[PDB]
Amino acid sequence: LLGWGLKQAEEANKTPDKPDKVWRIQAGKGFNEFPNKEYDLYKSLLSSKIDGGWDWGNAATHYWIKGGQWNKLEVDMKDAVGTYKLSGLRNFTGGDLDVNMQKATLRLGQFNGNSFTSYKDSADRTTRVDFNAKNILIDNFLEINNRVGSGAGRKASSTVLTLQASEGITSSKNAEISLYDGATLNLASNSVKLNGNVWMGRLQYVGAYLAPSYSTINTSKVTGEVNFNHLTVGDHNAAQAGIIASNKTHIGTLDLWQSAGLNIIAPPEGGYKQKTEVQPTQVIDGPFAGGKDTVVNIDRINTKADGTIKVGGFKASLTTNAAHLNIGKGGVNLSNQASGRTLLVENLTGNITVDGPLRVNNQVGGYALAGSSANFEFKAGVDTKNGTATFNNDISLGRFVNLKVDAHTANFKGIDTGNGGFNTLDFSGVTNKVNINKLITASTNVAVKNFNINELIVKTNGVSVGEYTHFSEDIGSQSRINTVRLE
């Protein structure tokens, strides 16, 4: 019920833990003299101070450091050369690694995945697993803060995974990163390029459809080229993911759930940076404004939608503070079940530039039933009130679909509502101008205070009555239409 902005700002500034028995391992001879050897990291080095096991109560396996889950382990290589791999460390509960590998390639997957989880003690600890490799090369799935077995036993608190390459963090095609309710993920390389299905927000327990399920991917340190490929937020719940980006974020296909949010956050303008017991200062940030050169290049926004029938829709949404928000040639899809699903492509302090056709149920026409009001909704520059919402591609609306745009200046290239009807084509939030190029209406509820639609076809609507183009608010004194053409 907190929302993502409180929970991230609470999880950001924490002391790590108070660990007793801080184990230390230093890799000595043999490692720093074979540059191609393809070692194994668990079996040859890490298994000295990590013991396996079984958890009585929902186990498959189990791992911790030494003498319980409250013991920090350092590994201090700093000159080991080779390629190392984990390849099967599943359900690591543990706590506080930091594998320190300069000039050493890692590989977080080979024939088997990985996992990094915590346990809900009375202290509610995090795990803070770190790596400091040269390349990372995920190459098989990695799950952060998963379910250990099946539901029962001890529950799972939050965790943090930090990956700190210095040449790149790539991924294979079938390497599904999937991070859950408490999980974060820090990346600090240059040129992150995750070619696999990143999955923020996922069903941590088998029935918990009402969990909050926050998650975070903090690519703020990436001095290179952030490049996701297939982001997928939410799974049968109201997930609120978030990405703290680095002012250039090209992602590929984005698949929101029905009621799943997203908070892509660009950096600021100049870049980042008995007895009374006084807690340390918790600095907390509201929604600020991104810099001048912040771009978020999504190229397709689908929506996965099946399930219940609620009294409204579910309002899939994404929220950005970047100075631009381009949406590529894939356009916008919106799957629509019985009630009216809703999309909110909101931008706080920037622009919006859509370059694709607005689909619904994955076609351009996309009919809907009576109560199913498929509602697109765009917000360009809410908090600065000088953001345009340009659509450089010809949109087309079918039946029971309701575009609305609340921007400063909503440019267009053509709106064709002549096929379906019952279209509430709202523009009431637009401050001054709506520069539509070619409008085709059958039975529409246009609400514009000032416009110049410089071509207007008005179709008829068959044989039914009581349906008509209806401008529903004050046209003002600056309006204009350079061509009306009834048919």
For residues 376 to 415, the per-residue mask of contacts with a copy of itself, x marking binding by CB under 8 A and - elsewhere, is: -------x--------------------------------
Q: Of 70 and 257, which CB lies nearer to a copy of itself in the complex structure?
A: 70
For residues 158 to 197, the per-residue mask of contacts with a copy of itself, x marking binding by CB under 8 A and - elsewhere, is: ----------------------------------------
Q: Of 279 and 482, which CB lies nearer to a copy of itself in the complex structure?
A: 279
| 304 contacts 341 by C-beta, under 8 angstroms | no
Say whether residue 50 binds a copy of itself (CB under 8 A).
Answer: no
Candidate ranges 20-28, 165-173, 292-300, 361-369; the one touching a copy of itself (CB under 8 A): 20-28
**The two structure tokens encoding residue 35:** 């540059």
Q: Which residues contact 362 (CB under 8 A, 6 or more apart)?
A: 302, 333, 335
For residues 71 to 110, the per-residue mask of contacts with a copy of itself, x marking binding by CB under 8 A and - elsewhere, is: -----x----------------------------------
| 164 contacts 192 by C-beta, under 8 angstroms | no
- Shortest Cβ distance from residue 399 to a copy of itself (Å)? 37
Say whether residue 2 binds a copy of itself (CB under 8 A).
Answer: yes
Calculated CA dihedral for residues 243, 249, 252, 256, nearest 10 degrees:
30
Q: How many CB atoms lie within 10 A of CB 13?
A: 11
| 206 contacts 150 by C-beta, under 8 angstroms | yes
| Type of residue found at 68 | G
- Shortest Cβ distance from residue 138 to a copy of itself (Å)? 24
Q: Using CA atoms, how far apart are residues 236 and 260, in angstroms rounded to an integer? A: 9
Q: Which of 123, 152, 284, 338 binds a copy of itself (CB under 8 A)?
A: 284
Stated as kind and residue range, the H or E segment containing 256 is strand 253-256
Say whether residue 30 binds a copy of itself (CB under 8 A).
Answer: yes
DSSP summary character for residue 426: B
| 267 contacts 220 by C-beta, under 8 angstroms | yes
Q: Of 13 and 363, which CB lies nearer to a copy of itself in the complex structure?
A: 13
Say whether residue 33 binds a copy of itself (CB under 8 A).
Answer: yes
| DSSP state letters, 457-470 | EE---TT-SS----
Q: Using CA atoms, how far apart are residues 315 and 212, in angstroms rounded to an integer? A: 16
Q: Using CA atoms, how far apart are residues 408 and 405, in angstroms rounded to an integer? A: 9
Give the footprint of a copy of itself on residues 252-281 (CB under 8 A): 268, 274-281
Strand order in the sheet with 263-265: 243-244, 263-265, 316-320, 343-347, 378-380, 405-406
Give the footprint of a copy of itself on residues 326-385 (CB under 8 A): 383
Name the residue among 78, 133, 144, 73 with its Cα closest to residue 106. Answer: 133
- Shortest Cβ distance from residue 278 to a copy of itself (Å)? 5
Q: Of 22 and 481, which CB lies nearer to a copy of itself in the complex structure?
A: 22
Q: Which of 209, 212, 225, 288 binds a copy of itself (CB under 8 A)?
A: 288
Say whether residue 123 binds a copy of itself (CB under 8 A).
Answer: no
Beta bridge partners of 326: 297, 353
DSSP summary character for residue 110: S
Q: Of 286 and 466, which CB lies nearer to a copy of itself in the complex structure?
A: 286
Say whether residue 153 binds a copy of itself (CB under 8 A).
Answer: no
Say whether residue 282 binds a copy of itself (CB under 8 A).
Answer: yes
Q: Using CA atoms, how far apart are residues 9 and 13, in angstroms rounded to an integer? A: 7
Q: Using CA atoms, how far apart are residues 97 and 71, in angstroms rounded to an integer? A: 9
**The two structure tokens encoding residue 313:** 């829709």
- Shortest Cβ distance from residue 371 to a copy of itself (Å)? 29
| 291 contacts 323 by C-beta, under 8 angstroms | yes
Q: Of 431 and 435, which CB lies nearer to a copy of itself in the complex structure?
A: 431
Q: Of 71 and 171, which CB lies nearer to a copy of itself in the complex structure?
A: 71
| Type of residue found at 167 | E
Q: Which of 39, 199, 391, 451 binds a copy of itself (CB under 8 A)?
A: 39
Q: Of 29 and 485, which CB lies nearer to a copy of itself in the complex structure?
A: 29
Q: Of 75 and 262, which CB lies nearer to a copy of itself in the complex structure?
A: 75
**The two structure tokens encoding residue 8:** 């991230």
Q: Of 11 and 455, which CB lies nearer to a copy of itself in the complex structure?
A: 11
Binding site for a copy of itself (CB under 8 A): 1-3, 5-6, 9-10, 18-31, 33-34, 37, 39, 43-45, 47-49, 76, 268, 274-289, 383
